Design a binder for these strands. Structure first.
Ligand code: FES
Ligand SMILES: [K+]
Ligand SMILES: [K+]
Ligand SMILES: [Mg+2]
Ligand SMILES: [Mg+2]
Ligand SMILES: [Mg+2]
Ligand SMILES: [Mg+2]
Ligand SMILES: [Mg+2]
Ligand SMILES: [Mg+2]
Ligand SMILES: [Zn+2]
Lengths: 115, 164, 190, 52, 232, 50, 291, 109, 77
RNA sequence: AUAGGUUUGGUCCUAGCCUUUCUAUUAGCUCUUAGUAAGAUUACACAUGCAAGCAUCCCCGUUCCAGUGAGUUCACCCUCUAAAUC
């Protein structure tokens, strides 16, 4: 199928069931449906903690590197995941949101002290 | 019962029992053989029993037969480079002919094993998807992970209906 | 009310059981009533509905002294092929679907507790090489930033902008300004 | 510096291949010239609104 | 207990055969009705008897009264017994393909626990003979008398492993997948053993059945095959 | 394959009519300073530009 | 140096001590059955088939390597304090590139505190089972390995089944593997069930454990009672090479003890029940003279 | 990479020579019947450029793909004549033959 | 979704998208953080691209592949 | 198909029809709770409301997603080679 423009992008395809999400890390054309045709499955991500309290993330680092070197883009959630894995620098918004949460809880603690 | 002499020839097991997988150079195989004459007996057997297997393992190689055109039977292979390989098969048994062509133009076991290992890499066991391609469909099939809501209702705190 | 509920296996060593069944399986004499020569491919869902037994109860439901318990090994053995180690499907013995599910769970629990003998294969090792010298399982040399206690990259930390740049931003966003944020708390507030 | 995990993988591969040098792996960024976002773009490549 | 159906005589037991005039008792033999027919009136009954240990037979009885026909068939059956060889006393020694008149019967030896997946009359006769594991397919006309005659003929004309060894003068070696490459010698020649090996037939000229090949290749699609059924 | 000539005809006619009725910069980038909209399209300009 | 378990001489001694019973090695399995096949064979063909079966059994009896308990993995890759408190559960990142050995594959954990550390051994094995499932292994440890169920399995004389389950479930150098194997060996020694492991691949490991813990008296007694005198002498020689500075080995060198005399020297020097060893050896010699 | 024609080398029998410098050649391949699992001949016609018009009806010829088709139906050229109709030279011995009989004895040389 | 031929809803004709308020210090710090992060990510992308090209060059016109090709040709001869 | 019923005064053979099995839709009668999956008959006609914005103006997007199954060997492989991403 020929799309006008577009590019390959490594992103998260949502599967699972209602109230039980699960993600597949796939390299696919940006114009394709979210859960539709893909070029290669590059990993997976279970956002629900398991019986060990762990969120499991599988990354095909070799193929991820190959597709990045082949010109594939990255969705923001995948960039944040790779930053958490240590594969990239921490995304600026992770740091900014951490600081925002710090300030919010500082305000709440000051409210508690004031009361 | 199944029609014809030696009906076993028309079973997928027999057809897949062949051990000759040609190198990519081979494009055409001509089989010149004679219908009568004891010295050509093996060649006739080679046509009767082994050509189906050779074709089954090599679908894209053009095999063509010729009958009583020369005083003796022989095989000729035409390669992509333009080279031609002539194999005289008079006085040879069909098994001998099969072994000879395997030796001179057949991929060795090592190349076949490498190709099989290459085929293995495409089916990554860790991938999730439909059963036609993947071992498992969902991470919920993994023990210790949160199970499917179809089989085990999720706790009410984890359901949007009771979070809204 | 069965006296064998706490110790079900005793029932299979009692003379009453021997008189009733002898040496044959408890399902030997059962026969499903159905139309046609080919039976339905599933047994009934259950023989007991609201504490009432149906006319032709299955082998397990027709005898109340037979308890499907993972300790009742000798009973569970009668529902597994002794030559192949496979649990019979419900139409084979005629046990209802509910009791078949209970029997399957009991057999699995007995096998898990080592009470029921089953064929355990001899498998090959996972890894060809058992070396643990690779960095993935060994220790990686710490990076200088980790040693010094600094963040991995300098920009992970807050740097207060110069006053001039903040003034440009305030000029650029006249009338659409929020309160300036100071440096964040160093540690996560508790 | 490389990211933590990537640095660890590079060092692990080096140690596997016999290299024992203690130099840190580093990413060269001299060739990465950060143009400001407000730098003028190429107007020759830009499109034009269509008549409607 | 009912037979093959509620209103059917077939499969019903007639009890042990009567003590014969020869002075022998047959308390160990069980009798089963295979067919009851009205002859135009009299009754013609086909019954089979067997002791569960290889000795089995069958007979026809004709009489105006049904009970007299049963008694005649049973007493005549006990005096026309076959002996059926059994491999390890549970199955037949080899696959048997036979045609009696217009009835074709294909029987296959099966491992232990396979059960009797056979025509119901074949199941009854096999229970009488003592065969416990076998597959059977009946084709052509399903005529009860021809079926019984063909079954007894084929089962009586099976070559045991000892017979094969004595004929070929060679060790009969069994290969079981469950037992790995261990060769199990099931029969050895009573006389001397030939020192020359059998010809290594590269392709045997056997007559294959298209149904078996289709089943092996997965091209059989019947909705009626391999259906769940009660123990037999 | 039954040729679709009308498609080519329409494509050529549209290309010609687009190259001969090109809107000029005076039409494209005019602005109504009271409402800050483009009269050519009617689209309002972003707030930060006003 | 001291011979390793995989030393050629040690491997040969343990292979000969194990024995090869084709009936026990290829005992009929309880699995899906198919109709058997038949072949007409001459005596030479039968002997060739038996020889091939012997080679297959030799492949089947290949002793697993004996490995030392692995050192715990405690390595930190990064400490990103900025991420402290931004998450409530840990992230486990497994590299699933296909053509990587599982002991060289990077598996890391980002903790809620912001620490990026390497995965522990148990987490590594769990992840490898999650993404590269292996037949016979489970992600959650089976309950059969609890002490009560292991006791039941021992009572049923199913030690080989226990060892097969352990091999399938645990890695050779893991703590659980070593603990279960040691319990199995201890029970075998306590109840004189060494014959259960003969003609199996676990006999060599059991013998190695007994020799290294200096508890070969029961195995010597069993071998003497079973008239496997060559095995007893080979066991004594193995004990002496693994403990060449022991009084038993020095006694053997001083008295120049060979054959049964080696057993006598061991019984007199460094046997916990040398008296019973001497009694059994004397009975064996008397029975041999009578025969 | 060397040609856009699918069939690179093929062997066939010349069935027509009525076109100028073009031989119509019949090529037979073996195709498995999915139901009977037997191999049957499937025939296809090819036009081969014969610049010298040296092909005769009935001879067995080798066709080599052109780098690009020179006409609508001409995608090949005549590489050689494997067997000249009625003028076969035994490849094994190199001597003329008429069917299964040698026209010239191999011993003569 | 709508196509370019579908008309705009009549309840949105008077809609004005008011830009969000800006925190100056956070804005400046975030701009710097994005700049540094994108520079690092382009460096990493360059390394990955070079790796891909080098693998392709090692596969075609390599050295071990060249040995393999020569060995296979000599075997054929 | 492990097969069964039905032609004749009767037997055997051939042969059709039907029975038994498993799904999907609709209809009758009857239906309590929870989780999950699926969900016009009609390429017939459509009231009404929404489904495409973003952005310091240019551009970019609205060519995607979503829908239907009317027509129907434009889908797959190779050669060559535009547009697009790096
Ligand atoms: S199939 Fe996994 S959540 Fe439903
Ligand atoms: K825009
Ligand atoms: K349609
Ligand atoms: Mg009835
Ligand atoms: Mg009929
Ligand atoms: Mg929709
Ligand atoms: Mg679409
Ligand atoms: Mg239509
Ligand atoms: Mg281009
Ligand atoms: Zn029941």
């Amino acid at each position: 199928k020929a799309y006008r423009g577009g590019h390959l992008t490594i992103r998260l395809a949502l599967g699972g069931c209602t109230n039980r999400p699960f993600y597949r890390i796939v390299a696919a054309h940006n114009k394709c449906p979210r859960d539709g045709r893909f070029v290669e499955q590059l990993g997976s991500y279970d956002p629900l903690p398991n019986s060990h309290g762990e969120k499991l993330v599988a990354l095909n680092l070799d193929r991820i590197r190959h597709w990045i070197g082949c010109g594939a883009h990255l969705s923001k959630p995948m960039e944040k995941l790779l930053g958490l894995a240590g594969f990239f620098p921490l995304h600026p918004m992770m740091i900014t949101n951490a600081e925002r949460l710090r300030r919010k809880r500082a305000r709440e603690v000051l409210l508690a002290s004031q009361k | 019962p199944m029609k014809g002499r030696f009906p076993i020839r028309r079973t997928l097991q027999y057809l897949s029992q062949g051990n000759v997988v040609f190198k990519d150079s081979v494009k055409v195989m001509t089989v010149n053989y004679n219908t009568h004459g004891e010295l050509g007996e093996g060649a006739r057997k080679f046509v009767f029993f082994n050509i189906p297997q050779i074709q089954y393992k090599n679908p894209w190689v053009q095999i063509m037969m010729f009958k009583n055109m020369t005083p003796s039977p022989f095989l000729r292979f035409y390669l992509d480079s333009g080279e031609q390989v002539l194999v005289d098969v008079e006085t040879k048994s069909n098994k001998e002919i099969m072994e000879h062509i395997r030796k001179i133009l057949g991929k060795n076991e090592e190349t076949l094993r490498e190709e099989e290992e290459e085929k293995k890499q495409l089916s990554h066991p860790a991938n999730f998807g439909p059963r036609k391609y993947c071992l498992r469909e969902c991470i919920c099939e993994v023990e210790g992970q949160v199970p499917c809501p179809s089989l085990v209702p999720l706790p009410k705190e984890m359901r949007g209906k009771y979070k809204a | 009310i069965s006296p064998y509920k706490d110790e079900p296996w005793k029932y299979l060593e009692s003379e009453e059981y021997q008189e009733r069944y002898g040496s044959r399986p408890v399902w030997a004499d059962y026969r499903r009533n159905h139309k046609g020569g080919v039976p339905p491919q599933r047994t009934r869902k259950t023989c007991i509905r609201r504490n009432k037994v149906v006319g032709n109860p299955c082998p397990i439901c027709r005898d109340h002294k037979l308890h499907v318990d993972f300790r009742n090994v000798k009973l569970l053995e009668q529902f597994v092929c002794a030559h192949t180690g496979i649990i019979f499907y419900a139409p084979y013995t005629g046990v209802c679907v509910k009791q078949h599910k209970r029997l399957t769970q009991a057999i699995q629990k007995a096998r898990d507790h080592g009470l029921l003998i089953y064929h355990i294969p001899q498998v090959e090792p996972r890894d060809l090489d058992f070396s643990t010298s690779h960095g993935a399982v060994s220790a990686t040399p710490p990076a200088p930033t980790l040693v010094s206690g600094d963040p991995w990259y300098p920009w992970y930390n807050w740097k207060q902008p110069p006053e001039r740049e903040l003034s440009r931003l305030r000029r650029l966003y006249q009338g659409h300004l929020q309160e300036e944020s100071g440096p964040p708390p160093e540690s996560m507030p508790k | 510096p490389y990211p933590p995990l990537l640095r660890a993988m590079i060092i692990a591969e080096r140690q596997k291949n016999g290299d024992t040098s203690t130099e840190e792996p580093m990413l060269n960024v001299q060739r990465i010239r950060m143009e400001p976002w407000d730098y003028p773009a190429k107007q020759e490549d830009k499109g034009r609104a269509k008549g409607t | 207990e009912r037979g093959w159906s509620g209103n059917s005589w077939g499969g019903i037991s007639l009890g042990p055969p009567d003590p014969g005039p020869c002075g022998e008792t047959y308390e160990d033999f069980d009798t089963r009705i295979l067919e009851v027919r009205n002859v135009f009136k009299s009754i013609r009954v086909l019954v089979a008897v067997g002791n569960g240990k290889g000795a089995a037979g069958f007979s026809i009885g004709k009489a105006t009264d049904r009970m007299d026909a049963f008694r005649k068939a049973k007493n005549r059956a006990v005096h026309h017994l076959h002996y059926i060889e059994r491999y390890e006393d549970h199955t037949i020694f080899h696959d048997i393909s036979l045609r009696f008149k217009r009835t074709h019967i294909k029987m296959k030896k099966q491992p232990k626990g396979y059960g009797l997946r056979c025509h119901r009359a074949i199941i009854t006769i096999c229970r009488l003979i003592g065969i416990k594991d076998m597959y059977a397919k009946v084709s052509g006309s399903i005529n009860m008398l021809s079926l019984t005659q063909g079954l007894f003929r084929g089962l009586s004309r099976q070559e045991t492993h000892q017979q094969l060894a004595d004929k070929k003068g060679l060790h009969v070696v069994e290969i079981r997948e469950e037992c790995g490459p261990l060769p199990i010698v099931v029969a050895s020649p009573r006389g001397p053993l030939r020192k020359d090996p059998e010809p290594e037939d590269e392709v045997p000229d056997v007559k294959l059945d298209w149904e078996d090949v289709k089943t092996a290749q997965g091209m059989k699609r019947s909705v009626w095959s391999n259906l769940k059924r009660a123990a037999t | 394959v039954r040729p679709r000539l009308i498609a080519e005809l329409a494509r050529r006619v549209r290309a010609l009519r687009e190259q001969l009725n090109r809107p000029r910069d005076s039409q494209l980038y005019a602005v109504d300073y009271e409402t800050l909209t483009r009269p050519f399209s009617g689209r309002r300009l972003p707030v930060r530009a006003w | 140096k001291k011979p390793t378990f995989m030393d050629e001489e040690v491997q040969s001694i343990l292979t000969k001590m194990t024995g090869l019973n084709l009936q026990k090695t290829f005992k009929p399995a309880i699995q899906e059955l198919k109709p058997p096949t038949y072949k007409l064979m001459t005596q030479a063909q039968l002997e060739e088939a038996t020889r091939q079966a012997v080679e297959a059994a030799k492949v089947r009896l290949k002793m697993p390597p004996v490995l030392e308990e692995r050192v715990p993995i405690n390595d930190v890759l990064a400490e990103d304090k900025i991420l402290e408190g931004t998450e409530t559960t840990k992230y486990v990142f497994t590299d699933i590139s296909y053509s990587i050995p599982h002991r060289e594959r990077f598996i890391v954990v980002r903790e809620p505190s912001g620490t990026l550390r390497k995965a522990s051994w148990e987490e590594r094995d769990r992840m490898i089972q999650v993404y590269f499932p292996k037949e016979g292994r489970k992600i959650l440890t089976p309950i059969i390995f609890k002490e009560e169920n292991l006791r039941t399995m021992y009572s049923q004389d199913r030690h080989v089944d226990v060892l097969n389950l352990c091999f399938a479930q645990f890695e050779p150098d893991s703590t659980e593997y070593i603990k279960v194997h040691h319990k199995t060996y201890e029970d075998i020694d306590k109840r004189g069930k060494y014959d259960l492991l003969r003609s199996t691949r676990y006999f060599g490991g059991m013998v190695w454990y007994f020799v290294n813990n200096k508890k070969i008296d029961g195995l010597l007694i069993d071998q003497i009672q079973r008239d496997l005198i060559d095995d007893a002498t080979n066991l004594v020689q193995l004990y002496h090479v693994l403990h060449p500075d022991g009084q038993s080995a020095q006694g053997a060198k001083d008295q120049a003890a060979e054959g049964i005399n080696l057993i006598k020297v061991f019984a007199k020097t460094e046997a916990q029940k040398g008296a019973y060893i001497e009694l059994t050896l004397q009975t064996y010699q008397e029975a041999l003279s009578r025969h | 990479v060397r040609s856009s024609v699918h069939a690179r080398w093929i062997v066939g029998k010349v069935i027509g020579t009525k076109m100028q410098k073009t031989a119509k050649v019949r090529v037979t391949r073996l195709v498995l019947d999915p139901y009977l699992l037997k191999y049957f001949n499937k025939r296809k016609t090819y036009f081969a450029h014969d610049a010298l018009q040296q092909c005769t009806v009935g001879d067995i010829v080798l066709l080599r793909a052109l780098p690009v088709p020179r006409a609508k139906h001409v995608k090949h050229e005549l590489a050689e004549i494997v067997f000249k109709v009625g003028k076969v030279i035994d490849p094994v011995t190199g001597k003329p033959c008429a069917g299964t009989t040698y026209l010239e004895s191999p011993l003569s040389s | 979704r709508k196509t370019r031929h579908d008309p705009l809803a009549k309840s949105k004709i008077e809609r004005v998208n008011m830009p969000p308020a800006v925190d100056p210090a956070e804005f400046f710090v975030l701009m710097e953080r994005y700049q540094h992060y994108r520079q690092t990510v382009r460096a990493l992308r360059m390394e990955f691209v070079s790796e891909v090209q080098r693998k392709v060059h090692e596969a075609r016109a390599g050295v071990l592949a060249e040995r393999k090709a020569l060995k296979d040709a000599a075997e054929h001869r």
